[PDB]
Every structure is written in structure tokens, then in C-alpha cells.
Amino acid sequence: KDQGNKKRQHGLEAKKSHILAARSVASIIKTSLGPRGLDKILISPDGEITITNDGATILSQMELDNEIAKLLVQLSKSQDDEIGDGTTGVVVLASALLDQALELIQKGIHPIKIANGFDEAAKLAISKL
Amino acid sequence: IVVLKEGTDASQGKGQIISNINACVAVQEALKPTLGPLGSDILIVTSNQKTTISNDGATILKLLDVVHPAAKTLVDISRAQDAEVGDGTTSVTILAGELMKEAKPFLEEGISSHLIMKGYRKAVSLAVEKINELAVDITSEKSSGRELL
Amino acid sequence: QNPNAGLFKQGYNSYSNADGQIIKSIAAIRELHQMCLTSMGPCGRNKIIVNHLGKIIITNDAATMLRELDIVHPAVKVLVMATEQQKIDMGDGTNLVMILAGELLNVSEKLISMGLSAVEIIQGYNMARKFTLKELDEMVVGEITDKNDKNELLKMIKPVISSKKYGSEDILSELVSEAVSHVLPVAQQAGEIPYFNVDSIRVVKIM
Amino acid sequence: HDAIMIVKRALQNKLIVAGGGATEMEVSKCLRDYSKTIAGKQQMIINAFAKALEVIPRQLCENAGFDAIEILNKLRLAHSKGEKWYGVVFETENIGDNFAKFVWEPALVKINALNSATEATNLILSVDETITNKG
Amino acid sequence: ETVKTMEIGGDRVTVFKQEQGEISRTSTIILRGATQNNLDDIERAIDDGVAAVKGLMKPSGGKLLPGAGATEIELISRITKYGERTPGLLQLAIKQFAVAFEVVPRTLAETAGLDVNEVLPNLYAAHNVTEPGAVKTDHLYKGVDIDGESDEGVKDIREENIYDMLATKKFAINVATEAATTVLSIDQIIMAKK
Amino acid sequence: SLHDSLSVVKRTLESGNVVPGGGCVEAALNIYLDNFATTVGSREQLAIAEFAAALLIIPKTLAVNAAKDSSELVAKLRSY
């Protein structure tokens, strides 16, 4: 149903569109990382106007129609209920990992192998830390 | 006043079956990433702005709501298979799409649908016989009622 | 800028043989003649038609397709009414009537192209119809003795089911014979007194 | 608990066939062998059906990140000789005996899936000319 | 006589049936199947069969004709002969009326995937044969076969007992000719805008 | 006619190493390569199979030019 104006993507196109959306989201909170982050002027779609440099609030008040970006927004919101202080860092690291995955795909590595390698690398990094 | 076809006409000939094949292949490609336990997930958004991510064949079929009259037949068959069997829902769709792809060159060469249907029925009967032969059910042949488990 | 002469009735749709409408009507009928040509025969095929309620209709009956299809041209309406009459009076042979009428019109097109007046074509068709109707009396090979037995009923039931559901005629014929035998009275060799009614048997389905 | 779950699933349906595409490969090989002794368009249709039966293992390998060409070639080479239990191993990218590894799927599930796919394909392809209303 | 609730395929229904007294004159057919399209097609076939059964009355109901186009070919030959005998311009119309009946074997051959270029001449030869005598003999009831796996020529009707009702074919021919005459008799269409 | 027949027969005889024509070579090569491809793999099986299938064009074209059903004739040739 509702076939008209129904969005669809191809493999080679989706694998790049998702990464572009991830980069666009990462640009939202890139400047807010660290104590010296920049304050952003946001007006929510409900009319809430405020100035803050908190990534959690920035992502909560900033809505968008990009489904891939909605995944990052939902992940940030879910994290906000746990610690909430690493939202900007988590989003930045996820964006960097997605860019690296895009680079690997351009080199001919299947996404599942990239995910497994990232999981193993995260395990090793956590163990070292 | 009331028009059953809503003023839309349709062509006749191999074009209709070719278009049906194209629609079925589109559905097969849409459901392809979800095959197998490692199949990729698909993000589907309903008209009510509800987003669901999952690789379950039944969920994908339910949320897709194919509008093409022909592919809807395959969607309904897959839904019936899932409801009655519950296993292989995506496999049926994939096999149907592959058979539709294979049938395209035969139609382009002038082979009638009856011949293709009869050949598919014969091949499926042979496949059923081979499955029955391959089927394993051991009670006391080189095993026991518990050793097999 | 182009002058219009010879038109005095109205600007509404109007067709005359001066422009070859006698062949245009046949061509228009051919649109559904081709549709119905794919239904007759044991190896017939159904078609997908979308109802006004958004439902999907699939059937091998040409009459159902015509009912679910929009009829505009009066020439097509004539054949639709003929098919309805065939179904109501006889209950079977709608595909036969439709295809025969389509082929008769197709050959009439060739006759018109040859230069034969429509009056002679109609007279010859009437004569050939009378000859064929008289000949059909001598073409009989077998005959149903009206024993009301399942074995004799199957002889007629089996061909009727064929061309409507291919591959299952063996079971459908047995089911129909069993259903009929439950309602037929104890009588044989009596064709003047009706015994069997179309509504005497109800059909239901369970998934 | 793990072993009990495994044996429970096995006992729920004791009629099983080799998984990992081994059953599909065996069916395809048998269909090709029969077609080699069948004349007419039936041979072409049977060959097409047998080739189509290999889609499931191909797509499973593709989704698993394995090299589809090499894994399929190895599966064809191994399955064509000796035992018919050779299939795709997903723990490691190679071909092995799924029956020995206890990798299986119900036979009835396979039969039902094949029947449903055949019915859908025939129903969609049963009509060459159609006049379909819009709605 | 008996009223009970019966379970068929998991669904329970109530049945009112008669055994000894007040024997019912009606019966019910219950269809089972996992596909709705197949069930609908079977229901249509059952309805058509029930309607046809009612047609077995005296007015040519019991009379049987050779089906699968054999009757059509015989009618083609007879009408062609009549048109050849018929003088005047009516011969062309009679011949075209005969040719119009060639569709049935053509439709049967095409729907079965058979090559018409070979089936049609084979049918013509089978129905137009020369025998060592003044009366035709042998297999004069050859029809149009569908085969589908392997076969040569066509099979005789008596092999499968494919027969058609005389009344049905006769009434269908009459109605088709009437409709064709009505359509052909219209050489101008005039309508008024609503 | 004798001159023409002698010319053609002499041409046939002078060839001391001949192979049957009329699609025999193409079909035999197709079958042999189809059998062979099942023993190679290594990414070459697909190419060998496609090359084998390619040779079937000649018999198909010959059958089409003969006003016959090419599918049936080619299938019978492959079966033989």
C-alpha cells in the first residue's frame, strides 16, 4: 500500500547513503565534544528554544526525517537514560567506525566481516583499557 | 460514473507476464537480504511513521503490502506457508523469484506458459521423490531409538 | 481552420459506415475476443481482476471477467448480453458463444473487405446456421439413458468440470456425482418431468 | 540443557535431511541427471528448475560474506562424487559433511516450501495475457 | 432425523440431515484447500457442473456429441460442402461460417502449447480420410489432444470419453449467430449527449 | 551434372581427415565440455559451461533456418 512516493534504495546506493547520513548526524554534535564544546541555538519542532552544548539535548530536540539518522538519535536517547555523558563521544566514534567501514567496503570487504572485525577490535580495546 | 478499472487500461501478450516477472523479481530482491540466520535487516516505515527493523520474513511481507496484483499472489502464498508451517517463509519467496527469473528467457523464446508449468510440475515431482529418498528416519538400522539423539 | 461539412446531428460520439465503422466495431470487439480466447479449452487460464472494493478476483470463467470488466461500446454490449442469455438459459457454453461470435465477426470483416454486401453476408450466415443446426442432429454418437446412476452422470459431469479447473476433474466429478445422487429421486428414463434443480446442491469451502 | 534442547528439537521432527544446501544440491544433481535422459522442452525446464534450486545456498553464502563463486564450485565438485551429504559449512568457509556435523532441516518443511514456491510460480506464470483492473 | 455438530478441518459446523423419514431433497458440498484461489476455481467448476446436470432433460439433454473439436471439424467439412453446393454469393458466406468454427481446435492447440501448423493439418487429414469403401469407417471420432509430455497426432474421443451436450452446442451456435447478425446489421451508431 | 558431382566428391575425398558436420561437432563438444566443467571449478567452471552452451547456437540457427521447431530438434540432438 501507499506505493506512490515510496522510498527505496539499491545496495551500492544504500551503502553510501547510510554513511552520508551518519556523517551528517556526526556533524551535529562534532563541535559539542569535550569541555570546550560550542553552544548551539536550537528550536525544537514543538517551539522549545534553548542554548546548550549537551549532545543529548541537541539530539533530543533536533528531529529529522532520515531513517538512518533516526537510528543514531534513538541510540543517543537510549544512552541518555543510562549515563548520558558519552552521547557525543559515542556518536562521534560510531560515525568514525561507519566511515572506516565505508572505506573497507570500497576496498572489497563484505559488511559482515567488517562488523566482526570491529567487534573483535572493540573487545581487544576494552581488554587493554 | 463508476468505473471498475478507474479508466486504466492494460496491454495483452507476453508483456503482461514479463511485467509480472519483473514485479516478482523486485519482491525477491527486496526480501533477499533477510534469508538465513545472518540475513540483513530491512528498515520499513508505515504510513503512521512507525519504524520497524527486523529480518523476519513474515514481518517484512506484512509491512511491505505489495500493491502489484501478481506479486501479491506470492506474498499471500508466503504468508500462508508461514502461518501453516512457520519455517522456510523466505525460502519459498526466493525460490519463486528464481523460478520467475529462469522462466523469462523461455517466454522470450516463445515457449508457452503451459509447457513451463508442466515441466516445473514434473521437476517438482522428481524433487519430492528425491527428498523422500534422502529423508532420514532411523529406528534400529545401525542405531537405536536413543542413539540417533 | 479546417471546415466541417456533413455533420448535423451533434458533436457527441457518433459513428457511421462511411468511415468504415462496420470494421471498427469488429476491431473493438476483438479486444475482448482475445481476452475470452484464452479461457476456452481444458488448458484454459484465469485472469487477475481488481474489484471496486480493492479485492483480487481470479477465475477461469469468461462471463465473470466480462461482468467485472467495463463495457462501453454497444457492439461489445451485444455480445455481453448474448453471453448472459447463454449462461441463463443453458448454464454453460459462454466461451463457445463468445468465441464463435468473435470469429463470425472476424470473417465478416474479410467478407466486407472482399466487397460483399452485409445483406448477403447475413443471409448466408442464416442459411449456414440452419444447415449446421440440422446437421448437429446427425452428429450424435452416444446418448445419456437417464439412469441417474453415478457412472452415467460422470460421463457428462467430467467434461463440464474440464476447462474450468484443470488437473482436478477426477475428484470434482466424483464430488458432483455424489452430491447429485443424494438429491435425485428414484426414477429412470424420464426426461419430461423435471427432478433435479440447480439450487438443490449447495457449495461451501473450508480453509 | 543445551543437549536437551538440541535433542528436543530433533525429536519434534525425526524426518530430517542434510542442511546447508546439501539437499538442494542433491535434488539439482538428480534433476540434471534425469533431464540428460529426457528429450524436448522438458529437458530445458528441468534444467532451469535444477539451477534455480541452487539459489538458496548461493544467497546464504552471499549473506554470510563467503566467496560465492569458490564456495559454490567446491560444493558442486564435492557433491558430484561420493556422498550426497556435502554442504556449505558456515562456521568455516569450506565444504563438509553436514550429516556428520548434525546440520539438518526437516524434510516436510522442504517439501512444503518447494510445493508453495511451485504453486506461486505457476499461478503467476499461468496467465500470459490478462486484463487487470486498477484498484 | 439427525442433528449433530461435526468438525471438518478444525472448524465445527451444524448439520441437519435426514436418514429414514422426510428424506431431504438437498445436499451440500464441502471443499477443503489451503489456497483461496483454488477453492474459488473449484467452487465455480462445481457450480458449472451442477448447472449442466440440470440440462440432462428430454430436449437434447442426453444427446452426446464428440468433443475436443471433432464435432467442430465435422461441421466445418459439412458446411464447406454445403456452401460449395449452394449457388450464388451465399457460397462465400457459408465458407466463411465454416471457417469460423476452426477456432476451437486452434484454441485447444494453442492453450496446450502444441504447434498449430502441425496439429491443424493433422486434424484435417484425420477428419478427411479416404477408405476402401463407399462408407467411412475406422476412427472417425478423433479429437484434439493436449498431451503436454509426449505424443504424436491426436487421441480418439472414446479413449477419454470427452463428449459435449447437443443442446448446449446447438443453443450456443444459435445465440452466437444471432449476436453476430445483430452486430453486423449495425452500420451507424447515433447517440445523444447526457 | 557429372562434372559438378565429380568436383564435389573429389573435394570430399582429398580431405583425408574429416569430421561429421551438421551440428554433430557442436553438440558433442557441448556435452563433453558440460561433463568436463564439473571436474574443474576454480572459477573456470562457469566460463567453461558458458562456452559449451555457446556452441548450441549453430544447431539452433540451422533448425530455425529449416522452418522446424528448433527446441525439439536441439533437445533430441543433446539427448542422443
Distance (Å, whole) CA B12 – CA A119: 55
Distant-in-sequence, close-in-space partners of C204: CB < 8 Å, separation ≥ 6:
E28, E29, E30, E31
B146 has a chain C CB within 8 A of its CB:
no
The answer to whether the CB atoms of A1 and B47 lie below 8 A apart is yes
Q: Which of D38, D44, D73 sits opposite F45 (nearest CB)?
A: D73
Residue A54: all three cell numbers together:
549537551
| 3-state helix, strand and coil shares in percent for chain F, rounded to the nearest 5 | 70, 0, 30
> CA–CA separation, C48 vs C128, rounded Å?
37
Tell which of B29, B55, B67, B72 to mutate to test the A interface (max A CBs under 10 Å).
Answer: B67
CB contact under 8 A, D77 and F41: yes
- Gaps in chain C after residue (C–N beyond 2.5 Å): none
Helix axes E36-53, C169-183, angle to 10 degrees: 50
Across the interface, whether the CB atoms of B114 and E148 are under 8 A apart is answered yes
Report how far Cα C53 is from the mean position of its chain's Cα atoms: 26
Following DSSP, what letter does each residue of chain E receive, concatenated?
-EEEEEEETTEEEEEEE-SSSS--S-EEEEEE-S-HHHHHHHHHHHHHHHHHHTT-STTTTSBEEETTTHHHHHHHHHHHHHHHHS-STHHHHHHHHHHHTTHHHHHHHHHTT--HHHHHHHHHHHHS---SSSS--S---B-----SSS-SS--BHHHHT-EEEHHHHHHHHHHHHHHHHHHHT--EEE----
Q: 26-55 in F: which are within 8 Å (CB) of D?
A: 38-39, 41-43, 45-46
Reduced to 3 states (helix: H, G, I; strand: E, B; else coil), residue A41 is strand
Distance from CA of D120 to the nearest CA of E (A): 10
CA distance D34 to D30: 6
Give C88 to chain D, closest Cα distance, Å. Answer: 25
Say yes or no for a CB contact (<8 Å) between B51 and A70. yes
Distance CA(B11)–CA(B18), nearest Å, equals 11
Q: Quick one: which H or E segment has residue C185? A: none
DSSP A124: H
Chain-chain contact of C52 with B2 (C-beta, under 8 angstroms): yes
Closest by CA to E175, choosing from C22, C92, C59, is C92
| Determination technique for this entry | cryo-EM
The answer to whether the Cβ–Cβ distance between F75 and D40 falls below 8 Å is: yes
CA C176 to chain D, closest CA, distance in angstroms equals 25
Q: Name the residue of chain F whose CA is nearest to D34's CA.
A: F79
A6 touches chain B (CB under 8 A): no
Is residue F63 within 8 A of residue F70, CB to CB? The reply is yes
Q: Which of residues 133-152 of E touch C (CB under 8 A)?
A: 141, 146
**B–E contact (≥3 CB pairs within 8 Å)?**
yes
How many CB atoms lie under 10 A from the CB of residue B145?
A: 10
CB contact under 8 A, B65 and A112: no
Question: Which residue among C12, C14, C160 places its CB closest to the CB of E52?
Answer: C160
Could you give the CA distance from residue E32 to residue E42 in angstroms, rounded to a whole number? 10
Contacts of B45 in chain A (CB under 8 A): 67
Query: In this complex, which of B76, B114, B122 lies closest to E113 when CB atoms are compared?
Result: B114
**Which H or E run includes A42?**
strand A40-43
The DSSP output letter for A39 is P
**F26/chain D closest Cα distance in angstroms:** 17
Contacts of D119 in chain E (CB under 8 A): 35
| Candidates D11, D41, D135; nearest CB to B6 | D135
Q: Look at the block and give the residue holding cell 473439436.
A: E69
Interface contact flag, D64 A113, Cβ < 8 Å: no
Which residue among B77, B80, B115 sits closest to E113, beta carbon to beta carbon?
B115
**∠A76-A81-A84 over CA atoms, to 5°?**
60
Q: Which chain B residues contact residue C68 at CB under 8 A?
A: 4
**How many other β-carbons are positioned within 10 Å of the β-carbon of residue F68?**
12
- Grid cell 516478482 is found at B24
Question: From the candidates E39, E46, E155, E191, which should be mutated to test the interface with C, based on the most C CB atoms within 10 A?
Answer: E46
Distance of alpha carbon B149 from alpha carbon C65, whole angstroms: 56
Element (H, E) at C205: strand C201-206
Could you tell me if A38 lies within 8 Å of chain B, comparing CB atoms?
Answer: no
Residue A68: strand, helix, or coil: helix
Residues of B with Cβ-Cβ distance to E113 under 8 angstroms? 111-112, 114-115, 118
Which chain A residues are within 8 Å of D65, Cβ to Cβ?
Answer: 110-113
DSSP code for A43? E
Q: Report the alpha-carbon distance of residue D118 to residue D8 in Å, rounded.
A: 31
Other CB atoms within 10 Å distance of the CB of residue E51:
16
Lookup result for grid cell 481446435: E105
Closest CA to D91 of B148, B134, A116, A104: A116
Contact D91, B82 (CB under 8 A): no
A100 — phi, psi (to 5°)?
-65, -40
**Helices marked H in A30-86 — which ranges?**
55-61, 67-80
Mark C186-199 as b/e (b = at least 16 C-beta within 10 Å).
eeeeeeeeebbeee
Q: Do D42 and E149 make contact, defined as CB atoms within 8 angstroms?
A: yes
Q: Which residue has the cell 488448458?
A: C43
A101/A94 Cα distance (integer angstroms): 10
Q: Which residue of B has its CA nearest to E108?
A: B114
CA–CA distance, B25 with B98 (Å, rounded to integer): 8
Let me know: does B24 contact B74? Beta carbons within 8 Å: yes
Instruction: Tell me how far CA of residue E160 lies from CA of C158, D112, E141, E142, in angstroms.
Output: 10, 32, 12, 11
Q: How far is D9 from chain E (nearest CA, A)?
A: 26
Cell of C25: 466495431
Task: Name every chain B residue with its beta carbon within 8 A of the beta carbon of D5.
Answer: none
Q: Which positions in chain E touch D42 (Cβ < 8 Å)?
A: 149
B-C C-beta contacts closer than 8 Å: 21
Q: Do chains A and E have 3 or more beta-carbon pairs under 8 angstroms?
A: no
Residues C45, B113: Cα–Cα separation, whole Å:
10
Report how far apart the first and last C-alpha atoms of chain B are (Å, whole number). Answer: 69
CB contact under 8 A, D45 and B116: yes
DSSP-assigned states of every residue in C36-61: HHTTSSTT---EEEE-TTS-EEEES-
**Spatial distance between the Cα atoms of C131 and C121, rounded to a whole number of angstroms:** 15
- Within 8 A of A68 by CB-CB distance, chain B residues are 43
Task: Test C70 with B72 for CB contact under 8 angstroms.
Answer: no
Do residues D25 and D75 lie in contact, with contact meaning Cβ atoms separated by under 8 Å? yes
Among the partner-chain residues B21, B36, B119, the one whose CB lies closest to the CB of D46 is B119
Residues of D in CB contact (< 8 Å) with E are: 40, 42, 119, 123
Chains with 3+ CB–CB pairs under 8 A to E are: B, C, D
How many Cβ atoms are within 10 Å of C170's Cβ, its own excluded? 10
* C-beta atoms of C203 and E31 within 8 A: yes
**Partner chains of B (3+ C-beta pairs under 8 Å):** A, C, D, E
The answer to whether chain F touches chain D by having 3 or more C-beta pairs less than 8 angstroms apart is: yes
A-chain CB neighbours of B67 within 8 Å are 1, 3
- Alpha-carbon distance of E179 to E100, in angstroms, equals 14
Measured between CB atoms, which of D10, D31, D127 is closest to B127?
D31
Interface partners of chain F (CB pairs < 8 Å, 3 or more) are D
| Strand spans (E) along D55-120 | 86-89, 94-97, 104-106
Q: Is B79 on the interface with E (CB under 8 A)?
A: no
